[PDB]
Amino acid sequence: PVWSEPLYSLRPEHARERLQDDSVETVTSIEQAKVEEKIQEVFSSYKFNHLVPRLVLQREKHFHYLKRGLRQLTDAYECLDASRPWLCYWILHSLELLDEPIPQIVATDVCQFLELCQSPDGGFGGGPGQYPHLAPTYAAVNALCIIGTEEAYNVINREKLLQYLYSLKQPDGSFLMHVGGEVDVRSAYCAASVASLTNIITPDLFEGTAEWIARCQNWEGGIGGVPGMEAHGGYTFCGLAALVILKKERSLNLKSLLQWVTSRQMRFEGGFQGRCNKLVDGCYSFWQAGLLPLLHRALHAQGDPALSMSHWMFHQQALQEYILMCCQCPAGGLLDKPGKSRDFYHTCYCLSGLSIAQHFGSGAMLHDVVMGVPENVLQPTHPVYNIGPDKVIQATTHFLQKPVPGF
Amino acid sequence: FLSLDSPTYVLYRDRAEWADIDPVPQNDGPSPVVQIIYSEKFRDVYDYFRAVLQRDERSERAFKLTRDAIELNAANYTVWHFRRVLLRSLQKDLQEEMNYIIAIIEEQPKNYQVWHHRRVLVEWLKDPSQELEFIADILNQDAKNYHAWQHRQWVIQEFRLWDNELQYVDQLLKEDVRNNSVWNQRHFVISNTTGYSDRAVLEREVQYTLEMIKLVPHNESAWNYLKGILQDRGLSRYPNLLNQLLDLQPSHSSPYLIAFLVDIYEDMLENQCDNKEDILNKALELCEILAKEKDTIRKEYWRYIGRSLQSKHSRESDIPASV
Ligand SMILES: CC(C)=CCC/C(C)=C/CC/C(C)=C/COP(=O)(O)OP(=O)(O)O
C-alpha cells in the first residue's frame, strides 16, 4: 500500500529496536545510546525536512577522492607512512568496486613504486627501504593482482617471498608479522593470501597453522587475535578466510561461529560491530558481514541442505541502508559512523561491505539486492582476498604456470 | 636532550653534531603514487634516520633520533626494530627504556608496535613486577583496549600471576557489567586455574551469571557467557536450566532469552529426548517469533535454524520417501 515505507530503518516498528538499558547505566550503555541517537537523527532526517528518501551512492564524489589520493596525500597520512602499499590497495580496490579503469600510466607507476618497497630478502615494506612486513606484503600482492598485467605479476619475487614466509614461521603453527615482530592471526591470513595467489605453498609451509588458528576460536564462537583473547571481527575474518584457503574450515566450530557473527549486526543501526557490546563501525561491513559468504561456502561444502539460495545470512537490506545513509561523506569517501572523518581504509571496506550485501553467489544461483537507485550497484568482490573475483582467477591461473619454488 | 614538541626544537640539518652525515632522501622513484606531502619536521627526521640506518650507525645520537622518528610515527616498525638493535648494542638501561615505553603507550595505546616493544623489554628483563599495575591504568582510561587485555593475558600466563586476576575481573564487572572484555578475562582466568569441570565452580559461575541476567536482562555479554560455559558438555545435560529460563519469560523477557531456549531445544533434539516432536514445535514457533517479531535483524539466520531443525528433527525426517 501507499502507507508502506520501503526503507527498513525508517519503518515505525524499527523504533522499538532502540537500546533497552534496563535502567542500569554503564559506560557501554551510555556510549551505545549516544550513537543510536546520532543514527536516529540521520534516519528521521527525511520526515523532518519533509522530503522523499532516496539512497544515492555518491560514485563521482568518491571517485574524485580516490583518483587524487592515489597520487598525493596530505601530511595527515604521515601516520600511514609505514603502510603505503595499503594505500595502494585500499584505493585501487575502491576504484575497482566503483568500476573505474586504471590507466596503464598509473598501473606502471604503482608497479614501479611497489618494486621499491620490495625487500631484497623477500616480501614488501611499508615504503622504500623499510623492512619487509606481512601486512604491506598482503597489500602489495593484492594491489598488483588488481592491476593484473604481466608487469604487475613479475614485480613479485616468488623465491624470496617464500624464503621470507619461512623465516617468519613459528613452531606452533603461527607466523610473525615481521622479523622481531608480534604474532597474531593476521599473519596467518596474510601469509596464506599471498602464498596461494602466487602458487608458492609448499607441503610443510602451513604445518600446524590450521590448528593454531583453531585454538584462536573462543567460548564466544568467534576468533580472537591469539588463543585466549576476545572474539573480534577482523581477526575472525582473517582466521576463517585463512582456513578456507588451507581448505581446513572444518577445524572450527562453524555452528558457534555463525551464531557469533550474526549477533554482531546491530538491531537498530543495521551495521556491524567488531565485538560484542561495542559500537557499530562501517568497516566491519566487510570484516563481519564478509564472513557469511565464507560460512555459506563452507557449509555448502559439507552439504548443508538448509542454506538459502538467494540471500546471505545477514540483513543485507539493513547493512546497505546503514552504509548509504550513515557512512557517506558529502565531499567524497566513506566513514566509520556519522561524526567520524573519512579515510581510505573506511572507503575501501564500506564499499567492499556494500558489494557483499548487494551480491549473492552460490555456483549457478545468483541473486542481487541493490538498495536505492540501481546505479548504486558495485562490482562483486571475492570474500577471501577482497579483490575482484576475476582478478583472483586471473592471478592464480597465471602463477600456476610457474613451478612452486624449488621444483 | 631536545624534545620534538619543544619551542626551541631545531631541524637536524641545522644541527652541528649532525653536519658530518649526509641525509638520505626517500627513494620514491621518477613518478610516485600515494605520495605523502610530509612536513618539514617529518622529512628532516626521516632523511636522517634513513642515513643512520643505511650506515648502520649504532651510536648514542642515533638512539636519540629514533625517539623523534617514533614520535612522528609510532607505527613505523623499522624504526622500532633499529631502536631495539641500539638498545642491545649500546647496552642501554632497560628500566629507563621501560619508563619510556610506559609514557608512549599512555599516549598511543591502540598501536601495535608499542605493545610489542614492552613485551620484548619484559622478556629481556624477566621482570613482570610493573605489568599488571601498568595495564590496569590503561584499562582505567579505556577498559576494552584490545592490546592491553592481550598483553595482560600474556603476562599472566607466562609469569603465572593468576592469584589476583579473578578479583580484578569482579571489580571491573562491578564497574561495568556490559564489558565483554572482562567476561572474556573471566573465562580466561577460570579455565586456566580451576577449570569448568569442578562442579562447585561451574555452579558458582552459573548462579553468578543468572544473577547478572536478573539484574540486566538485556546485557548480551552475560547471555553469551552462560552459553559459552554450558554448551561444551551439552545444554540438554542440564534439565533444570530450561525451566528456570522459562520462569523469567514474563518479567525478564529478552530476544536473547528466546534464542537461548532455541539452543536448549536444539541440543535436546540432538540427544533424542522426551516428546521428540512437541519440543520441535516449541522451537520452530520461537524461531518464527524471532525472525518476524523479536529479532528481525537476524531473519535470515532464524529462518535457517528452523529449516535446519525441520531438515532433521521433524517426525517425517528419517522416514523413507515411499512411506
Ligand atoms: C588483514 C588485516 C590486517 C585484518 C585486521 C582487521 C582488523 C579490523 C583488525 C582489528 C585490530 C584491532 C586491535 C581492533 C580493535 O580496535 P578498537 O577497540 O579501537 O575497535 P573496536 O572497538 O570496533 O574492537
Ligand SMILES: [Zn+2]
Ligand atoms: Zn572502522
